[PDB]
Amino acid sequence: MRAKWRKKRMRRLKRKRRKMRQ
Amino acid sequence: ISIKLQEEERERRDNYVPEVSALDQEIIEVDPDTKEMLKLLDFGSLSNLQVTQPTVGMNFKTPRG
Amino acid sequence: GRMHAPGKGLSQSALPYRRSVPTWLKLTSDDVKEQIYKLAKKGLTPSQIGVILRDSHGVAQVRFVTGNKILRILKSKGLAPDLPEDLYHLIKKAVAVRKHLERNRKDKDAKFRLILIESRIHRLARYYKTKRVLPPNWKYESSTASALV
Amino acid sequence: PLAKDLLHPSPEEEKRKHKKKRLVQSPNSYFMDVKCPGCYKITTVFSHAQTVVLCVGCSTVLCQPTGGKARLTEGCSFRRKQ
Amino acid sequence: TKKRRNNGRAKKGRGHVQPIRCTNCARCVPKDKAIKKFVIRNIVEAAAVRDISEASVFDAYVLPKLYVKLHYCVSCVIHSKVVRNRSREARKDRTPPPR
Amino acid sequence: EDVQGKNCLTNFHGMDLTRDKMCSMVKKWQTMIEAHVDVKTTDGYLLRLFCVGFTKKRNNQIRKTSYAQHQQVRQIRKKMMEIMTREV
Amino acid sequence: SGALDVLQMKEEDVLKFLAAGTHLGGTNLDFQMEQYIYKRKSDGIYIINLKRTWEKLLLAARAIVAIENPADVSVISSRNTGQRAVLKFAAATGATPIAGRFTPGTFTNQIQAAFREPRLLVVTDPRADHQPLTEASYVNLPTIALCNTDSPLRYVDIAIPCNNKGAHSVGLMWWMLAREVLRMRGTISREHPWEVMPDLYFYRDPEEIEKEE
RNA sequence: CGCAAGACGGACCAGAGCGAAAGCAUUUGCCAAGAAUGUUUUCAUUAAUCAAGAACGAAAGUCGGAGGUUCGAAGACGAUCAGAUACCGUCGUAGUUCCGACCAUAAACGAUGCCGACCGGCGAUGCGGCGGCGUUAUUCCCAUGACCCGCCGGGCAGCUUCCGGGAAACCAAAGUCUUUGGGUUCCGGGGGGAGUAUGGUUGCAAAGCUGAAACUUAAAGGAAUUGACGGAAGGGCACCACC
RNA sequence: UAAAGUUGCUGCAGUUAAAAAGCUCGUAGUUGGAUCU
């Protein structure tokens, strides 16, 4: 996996966790 | 081929000499700077040379690029 | 290298080995002192006085004729300026840059150069306070420093 | 190459160097006595002067500052000292 | 590992160089990294020179030329064979080919 | 601006150099200096004039490039503008 | 010369050097050849100090003489300019000539056919004869070279500062070297000019060969 | 042939310049700044590097306002395709432009901290100064420009070299290192987990700074060599290739 | 614990193997030219 795409995936994961964790 | 007769032929052909040496000339054109070199070498009293005038300018480099 | 620039320049004065008064120079030490007094009364800094004496009057070095340096002579006669001229010129440059920056607020280069100038000012002022040349309470504030100019 | 040695002369290799990089540093400048044809007295002028100096008895521009050595006006006879 | 000492560009002593678009693909390439060709071309091709010269209303018209500067990215310059890969030792030779 | 007797009478409107001519002078180891002036004749014809010049390689020059320094370029541009204004 | 009137420079030698243009260098100056030049001319040609040339020639002649077996000295010329001169020098002084291409490994490959082990090496030009020069650094072989202004002095132990581009100059330089070696050995004498004259050492174009007969 | 708008500043333009970096290219003017050079000026150690702290910081992105030509994330449609959700085409929103606030990140790179000393050669080039045959312009003296030949000082680089170093690539620094110590800041310690979790802090947001562990694993990696392969380039050959 | 000069004060590294802050300024800290029998 391209490193920048893995970074984008981790960013999306963090955003989803921030949304779910209210 | 390394035959001895070929070396003999080469050494006979190279054994040529004229009656007058090519370095035996009456007038030798010499620039002023080499004249000063000779004079500081204790050879400014030689009358076998002749003054050749220096070049007009210093245009000796080939153009760049 | 420069304190506030990547420059590595070498250009400076090269004093001659001889420390004697030149043979051509006929001014007595007192004559050089009076010329220094006149130039100071005219309103000139010691650097300017030295430059004028070198250029026009042939005084190669005042220290070698009078046995004293120009600032020391000015102090001893009593007409040396309140604050040293290098610090004065640094403060003047800072004041000029601040005046320019007041009407040109988008000049980040001017702000950076002002930061450099004030750092130089503070370093010189700390050195002068260490030597008791400036009062220990002296501080460079950028609110009325134009009066110091 | 065998510094400070008299056996191989080097006036020419020493005044070629930078003034600060010489064996003993020495300025490349000089003071010069100047006569103005209209004037009648000496004026000692620095070679690399930064001031527009005038004749001590007149109002004639003796020399003008340049990037390096100052430029003298025509007719003023200038001779180096020492 | 580093392939070239100059990194395949002429950027020495500056930070940024403005880009230009490749004439072949419209790719942004730095002006120093772009590969530049300056073509001088007769606007009339060699076969058509005779016909136009014969049909001219003037005598000895000397036909005008066309001056086009082309800037290529590395990919388009390689595909078009303006430049080509060289051996590790022949790479260092910056001398242009004879012309 | 007028047509009389099946004849159209023309008048000056502008002037240019041909594309090939102007492209042929722009060489790559010299400075090109351009100036322009808006200047009015005595009849009231306001003209914008563009002048172009190039620095010349000397006949004994070894240096590849014939660049002018920025102040030299400014002086040349000043001369060009002054001469154009004087002539128009 | 050793400050010896017997070994000092003569007027005939200086005249020959000037006629052959030995003092004329190139427009380039190798930094290790600086001490052998006099001054640069207005056209960029460096003048070679002929006193220094004579000193270095005499030192080279002394180095050549201090080898009892003359065949242990190798005289090399890859260029066509000095092949005739080298052959004449070898015939005169008994040295071993290598005129033409110097095959690599001649000093280093003891299996090779032409393998030879000289005790001294003389070359016509360090640039052209760089192969024997480099090989001399493998077998402890000292080197004597005819060096122009821009010649590199690596692996050159005795450099003779001279014009080595002109055929006259190279021939005359080899002729003087042979003459001085013979004079120092004991053969011939300084009380009379040598029977050989430098034109025999010169390189001549085949067109000139045809014309002059 | 005109008018309008918003962008941008070609060719000249370079292994050229300036700037702390990001970056910077129409003319002219104003404003303040700066390096180098020149200096027989002045002060006289005032310095170097830097926790804390601070200024600036591409692009994209956020908020408000103005503008909106072009291009254009998203999106719509047309193609190609087994499929394409992509490449390609036609449009096109945010954006791209400017003003005021935010963000503080880039392969922000020379993947190379700053300051100082020493250690080869050569030819160039940019700025300043110094010296000098000769050629041109100022249509006249000197000077001043443009050339030419050198020298000196900083600068961007280049070539070369058994200086020396290095695993080598390669580097006149990445040298002066087991013959190890000039000064000082930041920082690495097998590969993953992971720049993740969590806490703190900053931000309007996006996110930035700081930053683990359990666990897993014998290699991951660097440089160079020989092969093999290439939808890479250039050649050569056989009527089992063609003409 | 040594081996581990793989924690390097002695004594390690940091272009490409892990690594020099995007860049400057800057207080503390550290370090500071010659010179007095």
PDB file of N, CA and C (backbone and C1' of nucleotides) in Angstrom, chain H residues 206-223:
ATOM      1  P     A H 206     -11.861  18.384  12.879  1.00  0.00           P
ATOM      2  O5'   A H 206     -11.001  18.232  11.549  1.00  0.00           O
ATOM      3  C5'   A H 206     -11.610  17.914  10.307  1.00  0.00           C
ATOM      4  C4'   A H 206     -10.705  18.269   9.156  1.00  0.00           C
ATOM      5  C3'   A H 206      -9.301  17.694   9.228  1.00  0.00           C
ATOM      6  O3'   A H 206      -9.229  16.364   8.751  1.00  0.00           O
ATOM      7  C1'   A H 206      -9.165  19.998   8.775  1.00  0.00           C
ATOM      8  P     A H 207      -8.395  15.265   9.563  1.00  0.00           P
ATOM      9  O5'   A H 207      -6.885  15.587   9.190  1.00  0.00           O
ATOM     10  C5'   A H 207      -5.882  15.644  10.191  1.00  0.00           C
ATOM     11  C4'   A H 207      -5.313  17.032  10.319  1.00  0.00           C
ATOM     12  C3'   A H 207      -4.102  17.166  11.222  1.00  0.00           C
ATOM     13  O3'   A H 207      -2.895  16.802  10.581  1.00  0.00           O
ATOM     14  C1'   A H 207      -5.664  18.820  11.793  1.00  0.00           C
ATOM     15  P     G H 208      -1.773  15.992  11.389  1.00  0.00           P
ATOM     16  O5'   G H 208      -0.881  17.136  12.041  1.00  0.00           O
ATOM     17  C5'   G H 208      -0.383  18.202  11.250  1.00  0.00           C
ATOM     18  C4'   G H 208       0.190  19.304  12.103  1.00  0.00           C
ATOM     19  C3'   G H 208       1.132  18.867  13.209  1.00  0.00           C
ATOM     20  O3'   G H 208       2.443  18.607  12.746  1.00  0.00           O
ATOM     21  C1'   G H 208      -0.424  20.408  14.075  1.00  0.00           C
ATOM     22  P     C H 209       3.303  17.416  13.387  1.00  0.00           P
ATOM     23  O5'   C H 209       3.707  17.969  14.821  1.00  0.00           O
ATOM     24  C5'   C H 209       4.470  19.158  14.956  1.00  0.00           C
ATOM     25  C4'   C H 209       4.617  19.560  16.400  1.00  0.00           C
ATOM     26  C3'   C H 209       5.079  18.470  17.348  1.00  0.00           C
ATOM     27  O3'   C H 209       6.475  18.248  17.313  1.00  0.00           O
ATOM     28  C1'   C H 209       3.236  19.583  18.291  1.00  0.00           C
ATOM     29  P     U H 210       7.049  16.759  17.473  1.00  0.00           P
ATOM     30  O5'   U H 210       6.641  16.345  18.953  1.00  0.00           O
ATOM     31  C5'   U H 210       7.209  17.002  20.073  1.00  0.00           C
ATOM     32  C4'   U H 210       6.557  16.577  21.365  1.00  0.00           C
ATOM     33  C3'   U H 210       6.582  15.091  21.670  1.00  0.00           C
ATOM     34  O3'   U H 210       7.824  14.655  22.187  1.00  0.00           O
ATOM     35  C1'   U H 210       4.423  15.946  22.093  1.00  0.00           C
ATOM     36  P     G H 211       8.546  13.358  21.579  1.00  0.00           P
ATOM     37  O5'   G H 211       7.498  12.187  21.818  1.00  0.00           O
ATOM     38  C5'   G H 211       7.121  11.801  23.130  1.00  0.00           C
ATOM     39  C4'   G H 211       5.921  10.892  23.113  1.00  0.00           C
ATOM     40  C3'   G H 211       6.056   9.629  22.286  1.00  0.00           C
ATOM     41  O3'   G H 211       6.788   8.611  22.937  1.00  0.00           O
ATOM     42  C1'   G H 211       3.998  10.649  21.798  1.00  0.00           C
ATOM     43  P     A H 212       7.638   7.561  22.073  1.00  0.00           P
ATOM     44  O5'   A H 212       6.555   6.501  21.599  1.00  0.00           O
ATOM     45  C5'   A H 212       6.629   5.152  22.024  1.00  0.00           C
ATOM     46  C4'   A H 212       5.907   4.943  23.328  1.00  0.00           C
ATOM     47  C3'   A H 212       5.707   3.497  23.741  1.00  0.00           C
ATOM     48  O3'   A H 212       6.851   2.935  24.351  1.00  0.00           O
ATOM     49  C1'   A H 212       3.673   4.656  23.962  1.00  0.00           C
ATOM     50  P     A H 213       7.385   1.502  23.873  1.00  0.00           P
ATOM     51  O5'   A H 213       6.336   0.484  24.493  1.00  0.00           O
ATOM     52  C5'   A H 213       6.080   0.469  25.887  1.00  0.00           C
ATOM     53  C4'   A H 213       4.794  -0.248  26.198  1.00  0.00           C
ATOM     54  C3'   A H 213       4.669  -1.648  25.624  1.00  0.00           C
ATOM     55  O3'   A H 213       5.317  -2.625  26.415  1.00  0.00           O
ATOM     56  C1'   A H 213       2.715  -0.432  25.136  1.00  0.00           C
ATOM     57  P     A H 214       5.932  -3.939  25.735  1.00  0.00           P
ATOM     58  O5'   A H 214       4.692  -4.930  25.628  1.00  0.00           O
ATOM     59  C5'   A H 214       3.946  -5.287  26.781  1.00  0.00           C
ATOM     60  C4'   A H 214       2.565  -5.772  26.418  1.00  0.00           C
ATOM     61  C3'   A H 214       2.504  -6.957  25.472  1.00  0.00           C
ATOM     62  O3'   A H 214       2.698  -8.197  26.125  1.00  0.00           O
ATOM     63  C1'   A H 214       1.007  -5.296  24.735  1.00  0.00           C
ATOM     64  P     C H 215       3.748  -9.261  25.544  1.00  0.00           P
ATOM     65  O5'   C H 215       3.283  -9.484  24.040  1.00  0.00           O
ATOM     66  C5'   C H 215       2.036 -10.089  23.738  1.00  0.00           C
ATOM     67  C4'   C H 215       1.638  -9.830  22.310  1.00  0.00           C
ATOM     68  C3'   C H 215       2.561 -10.412  21.255  1.00  0.00           C
ATOM     69  O3'   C H 215       2.321 -11.784  21.007  1.00  0.00           O
ATOM     70  C1'   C H 215       2.094  -8.164  20.726  1.00  0.00           C
ATOM     71  P     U H 216       3.546 -12.769  20.688  1.00  0.00           P
ATOM     72  O5'   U H 216       3.945 -12.415  19.191  1.00  0.00           O
ATOM     73  C5'   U H 216       3.011 -12.565  18.136  1.00  0.00           C
ATOM     74  C4'   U H 216       3.528 -11.963  16.856  1.00  0.00           C
ATOM     75  C3'   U H 216       4.908 -12.421  16.424  1.00  0.00           C
ATOM     76  O3'   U H 216       4.887 -13.664  15.749  1.00  0.00           O
ATOM     77  C1'   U H 216       4.775 -10.070  16.274  1.00  0.00           C
ATOM     78  P     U H 217       6.079 -14.717  15.965  1.00  0.00           P
ATOM     79  O5'   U H 217       7.232 -14.190  15.006  1.00  0.00           O
ATOM     80  C5'   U H 217       6.983 -13.930  13.634  1.00  0.00           C
ATOM     81  C4'   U H 217       8.049 -13.040  13.048  1.00  0.00           C
ATOM     82  C3'   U H 217       9.482 -13.485  13.277  1.00  0.00           C
ATOM     83  O3'   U H 217       9.901 -14.463  12.341  1.00  0.00           O
ATOM     84  C1'   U H 217       9.273 -11.182  13.779  1.00  0.00           C
ATOM     85  P     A H 218      10.973 -15.582  12.754  1.00  0.00           P
ATOM     86  O5'   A H 218      12.300 -15.145  11.992  1.00  0.00           O
ATOM     87  C5'   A H 218      12.291 -14.833  10.602  1.00  0.00           C
ATOM     88  C4'   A H 218      13.621 -14.284  10.145  1.00  0.00           C
ATOM     89  C3'   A H 218      14.817 -15.212  10.338  1.00  0.00           C
ATOM     90  O3'   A H 218      15.784 -14.941   9.324  1.00  0.00           O
ATOM     91  C1'   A H 218      15.152 -13.247  11.583  1.00  0.00           C
ATOM     92  P     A H 219      15.784 -15.752   7.939  1.00  0.00           P
ATOM     93  O5'   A H 219      15.828 -14.619   6.822  1.00  0.00           O
ATOM     94  C5'   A H 219      16.541 -13.408   7.026  1.00  0.00           C
ATOM     95  C4'   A H 219      15.654 -12.353   7.634  1.00  0.00           C
ATOM     96  C3'   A H 219      15.440 -11.084   6.832  1.00  0.00           C
ATOM     97  O3'   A H 219      14.456 -11.254   5.827  1.00  0.00           O
ATOM     98  C1'   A H 219      15.795 -10.574   9.130  1.00  0.00           C
ATOM     99  P     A H 220      14.559 -10.469   4.431  1.00  0.00           P
ATOM    100  O5'   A H 220      14.280  -8.951   4.814  1.00  0.00           O
ATOM    101  C5'   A H 220      12.950  -8.472   4.921  1.00  0.00           C
ATOM    102  C4'   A H 220      12.889  -7.050   5.418  1.00  0.00           C
ATOM    103  C3'   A H 220      13.649  -6.006   4.622  1.00  0.00           C
ATOM    104  O3'   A H 220      13.016  -5.620   3.416  1.00  0.00           O
ATOM    105  C1'   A H 220      14.071  -5.678   6.903  1.00  0.00           C
ATOM    106  P     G H 221      13.903  -5.336   2.105  1.00  0.00           P
ATOM    107  O5'   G H 221      14.942  -4.223   2.565  1.00  0.00           O
ATOM    108  C5'   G H 221      14.526  -2.891   2.812  1.00  0.00           C
ATOM    109  C4'   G H 221      15.630  -2.071   3.426  1.00  0.00           C
ATOM    110  C3'   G H 221      16.803  -1.745   2.522  1.00  0.00           C
ATOM    111  O3'   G H 221      16.540  -0.672   1.639  1.00  0.00           O
ATOM    112  C1'   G H 221      17.615  -2.502   4.593  1.00  0.00           C
ATOM    113  P     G H 222      17.210  -0.649   0.184  1.00  0.00           P
ATOM    114  O5'   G H 222      18.685  -0.130   0.456  1.00  0.00           O
ATOM    115  C5'   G H 222      18.918   1.142   1.036  1.00  0.00           C
ATOM    116  C4'   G H 222      20.389   1.368   1.255  1.00  0.00           C
ATOM    117  C3'   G H 222      21.266   1.196   0.030  1.00  0.00           C
ATOM    118  O3'   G H 222      21.288   2.349  -0.787  1.00  0.00           O
ATOM    119  C1'   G H 222      22.211   0.029   1.850  1.00  0.00           C
ATOM    120  P     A H 223      21.147   2.219  -2.376  1.00  0.00           P
ATOM    121  O5'   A H 223      22.609   1.823  -2.856  1.00  0.00           O
ATOM    122  C5'   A H 223      23.684   2.740  -2.754  1.00  0.00           C
ATOM    123  C4'   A H 223      25.010   2.031  -2.801  1.00  0.00           C
ATOM    124  C3'   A H 223      25.296   1.227  -4.057  1.00  0.00           C
ATOM    125  O3'   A H 223      25.768   2.022  -5.129  1.00  0.00           O
ATOM    126  C1'   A H 223      25.816  -0.072  -2.160  1.00  0.00           C
TER     127        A H 223
END
